[PDB]
Amino acid sequence: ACGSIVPRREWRALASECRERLTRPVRYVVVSHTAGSHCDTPASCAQQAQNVQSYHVRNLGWCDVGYNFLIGEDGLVYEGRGWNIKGAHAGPTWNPISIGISFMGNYMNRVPPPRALRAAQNLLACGVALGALRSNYEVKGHRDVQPTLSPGDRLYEIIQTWSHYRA
Amino acid sequence: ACGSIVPRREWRALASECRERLTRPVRYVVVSHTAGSHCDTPASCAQQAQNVQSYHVRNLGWCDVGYNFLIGEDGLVYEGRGWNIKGAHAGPTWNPISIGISFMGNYMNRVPPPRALRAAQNLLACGVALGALRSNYEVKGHRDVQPTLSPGDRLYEIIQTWSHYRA
Ligand SMILES: N[C@H](CCC[C@H](N)C(=O)O)C(=O)O
């Protein structure tokens, strides 16, 4: 088990119905925030991934949670659509050429804790390590590719300092 | 770099006074339990890591927490002595030739949750990737190399199914 990713079944996900595959290795990573509630325990962040997926599935009518992975302030990564299934998180130009990771919260006036950030970068290395990502992958913030405040001012200024970030 | 580890400072560890280095690559991994209180959040697990360190330093007179790494039921790994410094967790024959990882809890009547187990296994893969552990490393229960009940019956039964387990 590559990163220490919480599997779909462990956060009680509805089964996915998405079919569209991403072509590896993938070039881009897009970092979003959920603009949802935050959580900082495994129990609270499992519920929160449930809740986000529930909105996407029941309400937006999507095949699964839109993000490939979610990050909790518990410092764990929650399997969304995964490495191999095209996401619904950054519009039609970016969904097919990226992995979308989303921090569970609103980081406009808040920073995610260092454990959340470590879990994100550990996830990405793990992606390289598996061949899901390019070794020279490029990180975009959600607002760099779509009109939105996502991932929040505070979170966005941090991912700007990441070695793989490209505006 | 590899994995995600909660660093010493983040859990508010006393400065280490330990100096003896292990010789890489290390061949053996010894898995214990602390036989202490469990914790299932980053906040409670950081506290617990302090308590364990406090006990070993202040009461037992050791140079640091005895373990190289601790595992919380929050699903995070807590930095102890690290990959490079000799632990105090398995006696004078095993301490110089092993990495000691301890699950924070009492696993006599109780299993650690899948996320603790994942954190532990991934940690070891990272030791391998790092050259800290041999690729053909062996995992031992604490009871395999010393008389005590550690790492606890339930947890012992689990580590017996790990692919690197050798009695
Ligand atoms: N490569 C990872 C280990 C994960 C196992 C992965 N190789 C798989 O079987 O999918 C690492 O060293 O962090």
Short mmCIF file of C-alpha atoms and ligand atoms in Angstrom, two decimals:
data_model
loop_
_atom_site.label_atom_id
_atom_site.label_comp_id
_atom_site.label_asym_id
_atom_site.label_seq_id
_atom_site.Cartn_x
_atom_site.Cartn_y
_atom_site.Cartn_z
CA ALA A 1 0.00 0.00 0.00
CA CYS A 2 1.95 2.93 -1.52
CA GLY A 3 1.33 6.09 0.45
CA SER A 4 -0.76 5.51 3.53
CA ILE A 5 -3.91 6.18 1.55
CA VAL A 6 -7.28 5.56 3.33
CA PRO A 7 -9.06 3.23 0.84
CA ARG A 8 -12.48 3.99 -0.58
CA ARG A 9 -14.19 1.32 1.55
CA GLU A 10 -12.58 2.60 4.74
CA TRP A 11 -14.25 6.03 4.34
CA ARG A 12 -17.49 4.24 3.35
CA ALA A 13 -17.58 5.54 -0.16
CA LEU A 14 -20.43 4.85 -2.51
CA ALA A 15 -19.10 2.65 -5.31
CA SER A 16 -17.84 4.60 -8.30
CA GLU A 17 -19.36 4.31 -11.73
CA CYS A 18 -16.63 6.30 -13.57
CA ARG A 19 -15.09 4.60 -16.60
CA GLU A 20 -12.83 7.18 -18.25
CA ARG A 21 -9.17 6.34 -17.69
CA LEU A 22 -6.27 8.75 -17.34
CA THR A 23 -3.28 8.06 -19.60
CA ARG A 24 -0.11 7.67 -17.46
CA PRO A 25 2.38 9.02 -16.74
CA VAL A 26 0.46 12.22 -15.94
CA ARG A 27 1.96 15.69 -16.36
CA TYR A 28 -0.09 17.94 -14.08
CA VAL A 29 -1.32 18.03 -10.52
CA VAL A 30 -4.07 20.56 -9.66
CA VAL A 31 -4.42 21.51 -5.96
CA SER A 32 -7.91 22.56 -4.85
CA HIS A 33 -9.72 23.10 -1.56
CA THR A 34 -13.13 21.67 -0.99
CA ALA A 35 -14.46 24.99 0.45
CA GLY A 36 -16.25 22.51 2.79
CA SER A 37 -15.90 21.88 6.50
CA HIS A 38 -12.50 20.91 7.80
CA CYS A 39 -11.76 17.93 9.95
CA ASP A 40 -8.67 16.90 11.94
CA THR A 41 -9.28 13.31 13.08
CA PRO A 42 -9.64 10.13 11.06
CA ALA A 43 -13.24 9.79 12.10
CA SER A 44 -14.07 13.42 11.20
CA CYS A 45 -12.18 13.30 7.86
CA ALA A 46 -13.77 9.99 6.77
CA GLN A 47 -17.17 11.59 7.35
CA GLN A 48 -16.08 14.68 5.50
CA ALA A 49 -14.96 12.71 2.41
CA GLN A 50 -18.31 10.87 2.58
CA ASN A 51 -20.09 14.17 2.68
CA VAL A 52 -18.16 15.63 -0.26
CA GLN A 53 -18.70 12.49 -2.37
CA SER A 54 -22.42 12.47 -1.43
CA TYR A 55 -22.78 16.03 -2.75
CA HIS A 56 -21.01 15.16 -5.97
CA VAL A 57 -22.99 11.93 -6.55
CA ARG A 58 -26.48 12.56 -5.23
CA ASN A 59 -26.62 16.27 -6.10
CA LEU A 60 -24.33 16.95 -9.06
CA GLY A 61 -25.13 13.55 -10.52
CA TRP A 62 -21.48 12.68 -11.09
CA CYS A 63 -20.05 9.12 -11.36
CA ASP A 64 -17.91 9.60 -8.15
CA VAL A 65 -16.30 12.24 -6.01
CA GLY A 66 -14.62 14.53 -8.49
CA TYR A 67 -11.15 14.62 -6.93
CA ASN A 68 -8.55 11.89 -7.48
CA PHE A 69 -7.52 12.23 -3.81
CA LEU A 70 -8.57 14.28 -0.80
CA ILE A 71 -6.33 15.51 2.04
CA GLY A 72 -7.47 15.75 5.60
CA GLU A 73 -6.07 17.93 8.33
CA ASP A 74 -5.70 14.55 10.17
CA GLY A 75 -2.66 14.16 7.88
CA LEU A 76 -4.10 11.32 5.80
CA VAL A 77 -4.91 11.09 2.14
CA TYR A 78 -8.36 9.74 1.13
CA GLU A 79 -8.66 7.77 -2.07
CA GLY A 80 -11.05 9.52 -4.47
CA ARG A 81 -11.01 8.42 -8.11
CA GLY A 82 -7.35 7.36 -7.72
CA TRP A 83 -4.37 7.39 -10.09
CA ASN A 84 -6.10 5.79 -13.05
CA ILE A 85 -9.58 7.39 -13.43
CA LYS A 86 -10.10 10.80 -14.97
CA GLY A 87 -11.17 13.36 -12.32
CA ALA A 88 -13.91 16.07 -12.36
CA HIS A 89 -12.17 18.95 -10.62
CA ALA A 90 -10.55 21.44 -13.00
CA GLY A 91 -12.80 21.67 -16.11
CA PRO A 92 -12.56 19.87 -19.49
CA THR A 93 -9.11 21.13 -20.54
CA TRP A 94 -7.40 20.01 -17.28
CA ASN A 95 -9.40 16.94 -16.05
CA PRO A 96 -7.85 14.66 -18.72
CA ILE A 97 -4.20 15.74 -18.30
CA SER A 98 -4.00 15.99 -14.46
CA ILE A 99 -4.49 14.45 -11.04
CA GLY A 100 -6.66 16.55 -8.80
CA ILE A 101 -5.90 16.62 -5.09
CA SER A 102 -8.18 18.59 -2.73
CA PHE A 103 -7.53 19.76 0.80
CA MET A 104 -10.71 19.26 2.84
CA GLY A 105 -11.50 22.74 4.09
CA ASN A 106 -11.46 26.45 3.28
CA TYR A 107 -7.95 27.87 3.27
CA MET A 108 -8.84 31.50 2.42
CA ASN A 109 -8.06 32.64 5.96
CA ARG A 110 -6.58 29.37 7.27
CA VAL A 111 -3.52 27.32 6.58
CA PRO A 112 -3.59 23.51 6.48
CA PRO A 113 -1.34 21.98 9.18
CA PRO A 114 2.17 20.66 8.21
CA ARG A 115 0.93 17.03 8.41
CA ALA A 116 -1.64 17.76 5.68
CA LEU A 117 1.08 19.27 3.52
CA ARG A 118 3.45 16.33 4.15
CA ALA A 119 0.70 13.87 3.24
CA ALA A 120 0.16 15.80 -0.04
CA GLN A 121 3.83 15.69 -1.09
CA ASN A 122 4.28 12.09 0.09
CA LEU A 123 1.20 11.27 -2.08
CA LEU A 124 2.80 12.90 -5.11
CA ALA A 125 6.20 11.15 -4.75
CA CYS A 126 4.24 7.89 -4.35
CA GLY A 127 2.56 8.77 -7.62
CA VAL A 128 5.96 9.23 -9.35
CA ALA A 129 7.22 6.05 -7.66
CA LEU A 130 4.24 4.13 -9.11
CA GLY A 131 4.47 5.68 -12.66
CA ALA A 132 1.14 7.58 -12.27
CA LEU A 133 2.91 10.93 -12.38
CA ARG A 134 5.83 12.18 -14.48
CA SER A 135 9.01 12.64 -12.42
CA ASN A 136 9.01 16.26 -13.66
CA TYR A 137 5.30 16.78 -12.83
CA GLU A 138 3.93 20.32 -12.57
CA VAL A 139 1.71 21.57 -9.77
CA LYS A 140 -0.94 24.21 -10.58
CA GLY A 141 -3.31 25.71 -8.12
CA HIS A 142 -6.99 25.36 -9.03
CA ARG A 143 -7.23 29.23 -9.58
CA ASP A 144 -4.36 29.03 -12.14
CA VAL A 145 -6.54 26.90 -14.46
CA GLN A 146 -10.11 27.86 -13.59
CA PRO A 147 -11.85 30.96 -12.29
CA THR A 148 -12.08 30.30 -8.54
CA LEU A 149 -10.55 31.27 -5.22
CA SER A 150 -9.67 27.55 -4.73
CA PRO A 151 -7.37 26.56 -3.10
CA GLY A 152 -7.68 29.61 -0.82
CA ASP A 153 -5.23 32.49 -0.58
CA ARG A 154 -3.30 30.97 2.37
CA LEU A 155 -3.00 27.48 0.85
CA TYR A 156 -2.23 28.89 -2.57
CA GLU A 157 0.72 30.99 -1.31
CA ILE A 158 2.21 27.81 0.18
CA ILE A 159 1.93 25.68 -2.97
CA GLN A 160 3.63 28.58 -4.80
CA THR A 161 6.79 27.76 -2.75
CA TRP A 162 6.72 24.04 -3.73
CA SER A 163 9.55 22.99 -6.02
CA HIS A 164 7.27 21.58 -8.70
CA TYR A 165 4.81 24.60 -8.75
CA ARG A 166 4.35 26.36 -12.14
CA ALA A 167 2.04 29.38 -12.58
CA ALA B 1 12.88 11.77 0.78
CA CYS B 2 10.19 9.12 1.67
CA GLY B 3 6.80 8.79 3.41
CA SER B 4 5.25 11.09 5.98
CA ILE B 5 6.61 11.15 9.53
CA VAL B 6 5.64 13.47 12.32
CA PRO B 7 9.02 15.08 13.19
CA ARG B 8 10.42 15.26 16.72
CA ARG B 9 9.69 18.97 17.11
CA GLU B 10 6.06 18.66 15.95
CA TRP B 11 5.33 16.24 18.84
CA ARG B 12 7.41 18.48 21.18
CA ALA B 13 10.13 15.97 21.90
CA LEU B 14 12.93 16.71 24.37
CA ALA B 15 16.26 17.10 22.60
CA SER B 16 18.00 13.72 22.08
CA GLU B 17 21.27 13.02 23.84
CA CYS B 18 21.80 9.76 21.92
CA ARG B 19 25.07 9.27 19.95
CA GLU B 20 25.50 5.58 18.96
CA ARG B 21 24.87 5.09 15.26
CA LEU B 22 23.44 1.98 13.60
CA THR B 23 25.23 0.49 10.58
CA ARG B 24 23.20 0.73 7.42
CA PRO B 25 21.71 -1.15 5.82
CA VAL B 26 20.00 -2.55 8.92
CA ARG B 27 18.81 -6.16 8.69
CA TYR B 28 16.21 -6.50 11.45
CA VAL B 29 13.04 -4.73 12.46
CA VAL B 30 11.62 -5.40 15.90
CA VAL B 31 7.87 -4.56 16.42
CA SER B 32 6.69 -3.77 19.95
CA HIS B 33 3.73 -2.20 21.65
CA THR B 34 4.14 0.47 24.28
CA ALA B 35 1.52 -1.34 26.49
CA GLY B 36 0.35 2.18 27.27
CA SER B 37 -2.67 4.30 26.42
CA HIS B 38 -3.82 4.40 22.81
CA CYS B 39 -4.71 7.60 20.94
CA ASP B 40 -6.54 8.17 17.70
CA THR B 41 -5.95 11.81 16.77
CA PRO B 42 -2.88 13.80 15.87
CA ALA B 43 -3.28 15.90 19.00
CA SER B 44 -3.73 12.88 21.33
CA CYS B 45 -0.94 10.86 19.60
CA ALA B 46 1.58 13.71 19.81
CA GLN B 47 0.85 13.84 23.51
CA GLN B 48 1.28 10.15 23.87
CA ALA B 49 4.62 10.23 22.03
CA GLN B 50 5.74 12.88 24.60
CA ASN B 51 4.55 10.73 27.55
CA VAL B 52 6.45 7.70 26.28
CA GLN B 53 9.56 9.83 25.67
CA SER B 54 9.14 11.43 29.07
CA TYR B 55 8.96 8.06 30.75
CA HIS B 56 12.06 6.68 29.03
CA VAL B 57 14.15 9.84 29.57
CA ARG B 58 13.00 10.94 32.97
CA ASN B 59 12.29 7.58 34.66
CA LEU B 60 14.47 5.09 32.85
CA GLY B 61 17.36 7.55 32.29
CA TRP B 62 17.67 6.81 28.57
CA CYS B 63 19.14 9.36 26.10
CA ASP B 64 15.85 9.57 24.16
CA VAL B 65 12.65 7.70 23.62
CA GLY B 66 13.85 4.13 23.13
CA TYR B 67 12.13 3.44 19.83
CA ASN B 68 13.30 4.47 16.40
CA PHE B 69 9.68 5.24 15.40
CA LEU B 70 6.25 5.05 17.09
CA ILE B 71 2.95 4.27 15.37
CA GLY B 72 -0.29 5.93 16.37
CA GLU B 73 -3.86 4.80 15.80
CA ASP B 74 -4.25 8.20 14.11
CA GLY B 75 -2.41 6.49 11.27
CA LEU B 76 0.70 8.63 11.58
CA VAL B 77 4.31 7.69 12.24
CA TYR B 78 6.11 9.55 15.00
CA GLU B 79 9.86 10.11 14.74
CA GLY B 80 11.76 8.53 17.66
CA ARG B 81 15.54 8.00 17.33
CA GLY B 82 15.17 7.74 13.51
CA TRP B 83 16.88 5.53 10.94
CA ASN B 84 20.45 6.25 11.93
CA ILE B 85 20.66 6.15 15.76
CA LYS B 86 20.66 3.03 17.87
CA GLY B 87 17.51 2.42 19.88
CA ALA B 88 16.86 0.95 23.32
CA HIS B 89 13.87 -1.31 22.87
CA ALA B 90 15.02 -4.91 22.50
CA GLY B 91 18.07 -5.59 24.72
CA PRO B 92 21.84 -5.36 24.14
CA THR B 93 22.08 -8.13 21.47
CA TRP B 94 19.18 -6.71 19.28
CA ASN B 95 19.43 -2.93 19.84
CA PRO B 96 22.70 -2.54 17.78
CA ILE B 97 21.40 -4.46 14.73
CA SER B 98 17.74 -3.41 14.48
CA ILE B 99 15.13 -0.75 14.02
CA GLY B 100 12.56 -0.68 16.82
CA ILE B 101 9.04 0.40 15.86
CA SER B 102 6.41 0.54 18.60
CA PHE B 103 2.62 0.75 18.25
CA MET B 104 1.29 3.19 20.85
CA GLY B 105 -1.17 1.01 22.80
CA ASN B 106 -1.78 -2.38 24.39
CA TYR B 107 -2.57 -4.92 21.72
CA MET B 108 -3.17 -7.95 24.03
CA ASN B 109 -6.99 -7.81 23.56
CA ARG B 110 -7.09 -5.44 20.68
CA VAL B 111 -5.82 -4.86 17.13
CA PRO B 112 -4.47 -1.63 15.79
CA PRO B 113 -6.69 -0.19 13.04
CA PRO B 114 -5.78 -0.73 9.39
CA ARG B 115 -4.29 2.80 9.09
CA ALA B 116 -1.74 2.15 11.89
CA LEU B 117 -0.81 -1.07 10.14
CA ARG B 118 -0.47 0.79 6.85
CA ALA B 119 1.65 3.53 8.41
CA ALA B 120 3.98 0.89 9.82
CA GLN B 121 4.40 -1.06 6.56
CA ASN B 122 4.92 2.05 4.47
CA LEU B 123 7.51 3.28 6.98
CA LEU B 124 9.46 0.09 6.34
CA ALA B 125 9.20 0.43 2.56
CA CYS B 126 10.62 3.92 3.05
CA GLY B 127 13.53 2.49 5.07
CA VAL B 128 14.22 0.14 2.26
CA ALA B 129 13.99 2.99 -0.38
CA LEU B 130 16.31 5.08 1.83
CA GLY B 131 18.98 2.35 2.21
CA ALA B 132 18.32 2.43 6.02
CA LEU B 133 16.92 -1.11 5.86
CA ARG B 134 18.06 -4.02 3.73
CA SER B 135 15.69 -5.02 0.92
CA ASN B 136 15.61 -8.48 2.45
CA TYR B 137 15.00 -7.11 6.02
CA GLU B 138 13.35 -9.35 8.60
CA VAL B 139 10.59 -8.36 11.00
CA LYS B 140 10.54 -9.82 14.50
CA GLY B 141 7.99 -9.55 17.25
CA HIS B 142 9.50 -8.13 20.50
CA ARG B 143 8.59 -11.52 22.11
CA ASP B 144 10.63 -13.35 19.41
CA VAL B 145 13.84 -11.68 20.69
CA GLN B 146 13.02 -10.94 24.44
CA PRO B 147 10.80 -12.67 27.02
CA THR B 148 7.96 -10.05 27.36
CA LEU B 149 4.39 -10.09 25.84
CA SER B 150 5.08 -7.17 23.50
CA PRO B 151 3.84 -6.47 20.85
CA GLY B 152 0.65 -8.06 22.27
CA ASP B 153 -1.12 -11.23 21.20
CA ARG B 154 -3.44 -9.67 18.59
CA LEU B 155 -0.77 -7.50 17.05
CA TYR B 156 1.72 -10.39 17.17
CA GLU B 157 -0.73 -12.56 15.23
CA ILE B 158 -0.95 -9.79 12.63
CA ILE B 159 2.81 -9.23 12.11
CA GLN B 160 3.21 -13.01 11.64
CA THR B 161 1.38 -12.53 8.30
CA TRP B 162 3.78 -9.82 7.05
CA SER B 163 5.94 -11.03 4.14
CA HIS B 164 9.15 -10.01 5.87
CA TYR B 165 8.17 -11.73 9.14
CA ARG B 166 10.74 -14.38 10.24
CA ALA B 167 10.37 -15.93 13.72
N1 LIG C 1 6.86 1.93 -4.00
C1 LIG C 1 6.39 2.30 -2.67
C2 LIG C 1 5.87 1.04 -1.99
C3 LIG C 1 4.42 0.74 -2.37
C4 LIG C 1 4.18 -0.59 -3.07
C5 LIG C 1 4.00 -0.39 -4.58
N2 LIG C 1 5.24 -0.71 -5.22
C6 LIG C 1 2.89 -1.26 -5.12
O1 LIG C 1 2.97 -2.50 -4.97
O2 LIG C 1 1.93 -0.70 -5.69
C7 LIG C 1 7.44 2.96 -1.82
O3 LIG C 1 8.62 2.54 -1.80
O4 LIG C 1 7.09 3.94 -1.13
#
